[PDB]
Amino acid sequence: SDPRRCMRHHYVDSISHPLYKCSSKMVLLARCEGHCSQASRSEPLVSFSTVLKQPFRSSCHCCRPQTSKLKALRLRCSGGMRLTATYRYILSCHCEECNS
Amino acid sequence: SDPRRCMRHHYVDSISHPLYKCSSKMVLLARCEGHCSQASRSEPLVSFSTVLKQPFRSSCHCCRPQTSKLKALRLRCSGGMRLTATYRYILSCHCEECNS
Amino acid sequence: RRCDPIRISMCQNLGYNVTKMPNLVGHELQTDAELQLTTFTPLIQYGCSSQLQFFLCSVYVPMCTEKINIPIGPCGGMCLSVKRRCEPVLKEFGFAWPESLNCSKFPPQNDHNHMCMEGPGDEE
Amino acid sequence: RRCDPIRISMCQNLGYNVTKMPNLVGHELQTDAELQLTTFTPLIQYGCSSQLQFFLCSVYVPMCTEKINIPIGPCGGMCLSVKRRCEPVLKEFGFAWPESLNCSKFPPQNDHNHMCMEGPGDEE
Ligand SMILES: O=S(=O)(O)OC[C@H]1O[C@@](COS(=O)(=O)O)(O[C@H]2O[C@H](COS(=O)(=O)O)[C@@H](OS(=O)(=O)O)[C@H](OS(=O)(=O)O)[C@H]2OS(=O)(=O)O)[C@@H](OS(=O)(=O)O)[C@@H]1OS(=O)(=O)O
Ligand SMILES: O=S(=O)(O)OC[C@H]1O[C@@](COS(=O)(=O)O)(O[C@H]2O[C@H](COS(=O)(=O)O)[C@@H](OS(=O)(=O)O)[C@H](OS(=O)(=O)O)[C@H]2OS(=O)(=O)O)[C@@H](OS(=O)(=O)O)[C@@H]1OS(=O)(=O)O
Ligand SMILES: *[C@@H]1O[C@H](CO)[C@@H](O)[C@H](O)[C@H]1NC(C)=O
Ligand SMILES: *[C@@H]1O[C@H](CO)[C@@H](O)[C@H](O)[C@H]1NC(C)=O
Ligand SMILES: *[C@H]1O[C@H](CO)[C@@H](O)[C@H](O)[C@H]1NC(C)=O
Ligand SMILES: *[C@H]1O[C@H](CO)[C@@H](O)[C@H](O)[C@H]1NC(C)=O
C-alpha cells in the first residue's frame, strides 16, 4: 500500500470535441501513475561491422495499463451533426519495459 | 549524492569476438544506472475516427547516456584474421523520456 | 472544497483522494463507517478476493468529485466477481451476505448515464 | 577479494565500488589520503569545476578491479579541463598547483593500452 507504487487513479473529465462545437458529456476515467521499483539502465554494445547503430542495451520499467476496456459515446453537435467518441477505461496498471 | 540517482558506473570487461576465436583485449567501460525521480504515467486518449490506435499518452523518464564518445579497437584472430570492434564509452548519464 | 478527505487509513491510498458523507449505506460520519469496515477485517485477511477491500471502501466511502454533486461507487460486475468469492466464506462465520451490499442496487456498468468504478473482476 | 572498499565518505558513491592502497601519490592508508582531500574541501565549495571532486578521488583513491592488478585513475584531458578552472583560484590562497597533480603523468586517453576514466570535460 505504497502511494509511490505504480497504480490506477480515478477521476472525471468531460469529453468535448476539440474543433466542432458540441455539448460536453461527463464521464469517469482512470489513469496509471507511480514509481516502478526496478532501476533502469543502459550499457554499451559491440559491433564488428563498419556500421554500428547498436549503441546500447537498456532497460526501464515504465508504469502502464495492464488491462483496459474500450468504450465509446455519441455527441450532439450544433446543427445536424451528432458524433461518436471512443477511448479506453483502464482496469489495471502494471510496470512493463519501455520498449516491448 | 544519492546512490539511487541515475548516474555513470565504471567497470572493466574484455571484448572477445562472439563467434570467431580470438585473443581478448581488456578495456574499461561505463554504464548508466539509477532511479529517475520523475514519476511515470499514461492516461487515455479520445478519437472521433472509427479507427482508434491512439490508446494513451504516457511519460516515463528512463536513465540513459547523455554523452558518449565512440571508440574502437582491433583484434587478432587465429590464422590470418585480424578484426576491429567498435563501441561507445559513456561520458555522461541523464534521465530522458522513453520515447524521444 | 465540496468533497472531503478520506480519514480511514484502511481505505486510504486507493484510486481516489476524496469522499463525501453521508454514506451510501447512510453512515453519517467516517468514524462510524470505520467501525463497520473493521468487522470485515478478518475476511480481508482470508483473501477470498484481492479486490474485496477496494470494493468495500467503494461502498462505505464512495468517491467524490467537485465536477458534479453525485457520489461514485462500484459497478455490480465488480461486486459479483467479489460477491461469489466471499459469499460462501461469510456463510462460514454463520453470516448472511448483507443487504447493504445487495448487488442489485449498483449500476451495471460505467457510462455517461451512470458512473461507477470497475475492476478486472467483472460480470453483467 | 583483491581490491578494497572506499572508506572516505567524500569519495563514496561515485562511479566505482572499490580501490587499492597504496596511493598513486604514495599514501599508505585511506585515512591519510582522507586528510589531504579535506584540505581541498574549501576549493570544492567554490565550485571552480563540477568535476573537481571526482577527479581528486580518482587520484587519491584510484579505482581498482579484480580483473587485473593495476590501478585505474583519470585521463589527462579531464584533469586539464579541471586544472584550468582551478589553477588560478588555487593561486588565490597563494597556492601553487601541486606536482602530485602534475597532469603530464596521467595517460592521454582511455584504451587497451592504457586505462583511465574520462569526463565530459576533455583535452588532448
Ligand atoms: O445518449 S443518452 O445517454 O442521452 O441516451 C439516449 C438519449 O440520447 C439519444 C440521442 O441523443 S444523444 O445520445 O444525447 O446524442 O439516444 C442516443 O443516446 C443513447 C445513449 O447512448 S449514447 O452513448 O449517449 O449515444 C443511445 O443508446 S446506446 O448507443 O447506448 O445503445 C441511443 O441509441 S439507442 O436508444 O440505444 O437505440 C442513441 O440514439 S437514439 O437517439 O436513441 O436513436 C436519445 O434517444 S432515445 O434513446 O430514443 O431517447 C435519448 O434522449 S436524450 O434527449 O439524448 O436524453
Ligand atoms: O594493438 S596494440 O595495442 O598491441 O598496438 C600495436 C601492436 O599491435 C599491432 C598489431 O597487433 S594487434 O594490434 O594486437 O592486432 O599494431 C596494431 O595495434 C596498434 C594499437 O591499436 S589497436 O587498437 O590495438 O589496433 C595500432 O595502432 S592504432 O590503430 O591505435 O593507431 C597499430 O597501428 S599503428 O601502429 O598505429 O599504425 C596496429 O597495426 S600494426 O600492427 O601496428 O600495423 C602491432 O604493430 S606495431 O604497432 O607496428 O608494433 C603492435 O605489436 S603487438 O605485438 O600487437 O603488441
Ligand atoms: C436485493 O434487492 C433486490 C431489489 O431491491 C431484490 O430483487 C433481491 O431479492 C435482493 N437480493 C438479492 C439481489 O440477492
Ligand atoms: C610536470 O612534470 C613533467 C614531467 O615530469 C615536466 O615536463 C613538467 O615541467 C612538470 N610541470 C608541468 C607539466 O606543469
Ligand atoms: C489529490 O491527489 C490526487 C492524486 O493523489 C490528485 O489527483 C489531486 O490533484 C490531489 N489534490 C490536488 C488539490 O491536487
Ligand atoms: C558493488 O557495487 C557495484 C555498483 O554499486 C556493483 O557493480 C558490484 O557488483 C558490487 N559488488 C558486488 C560483489 O556485486
Author numbering:
A (entry chain A), B (entry chain A): 34 to 133
C (entry chain B), D (entry chain B): 43 to 166
Reported in the publication:
Norrie Disease Protein (NDP) gene encodes Norrin, a secreted cystine-knot like growth factor, distinct from the lipid-modified Wnt. Unlike Wnts which have promiscuous interactions with Fz receptors, Norrin specifically binds to Fz4CRD, but not to the 14 other CRDs of Fz and secreted Frizzled-related protein (sFRP) family members. Our crystallographic and solution studies further reveal that dimeric Norrin forms a complex with two copies of monomeric Fz4CRD.
We purified Norrin–Fz4CRD complex and determined the crystal structures of methylated Norrin–Fz4CRD (dimethylated surface-exposed lysine residues) and Norrin–Fz4CRD–SOS (complex bound with heparin mimic sucrose octasulfate, SOS) at 2.3 Å and 3.0 Å resolution, respectively. These two complex structures show different stoichiometries: a 2:1 complex for the methylated Norrin–Fz4CRD and a 2:2:2 stoichiometry for the Norrin–Fz4CRD–SOS complex, the architecture of which resembles a butterfly. The Norrin–Fz4CRD binding interface is conserved between the complex structures. We propose that the extended GAG binding site may allow co-receptor HSPGs to recruit secreted Norrin for interaction with Fz4CRD and to co-localize Norrin and Fz4 receptor, similar to the role of HSPGs in Wnt signalling. Secondly, we show the Norrin dimer binds separately to two molecules of Fz4CRD, in contrast to the 1:1 complex of Wnt8–Fz8CRD.
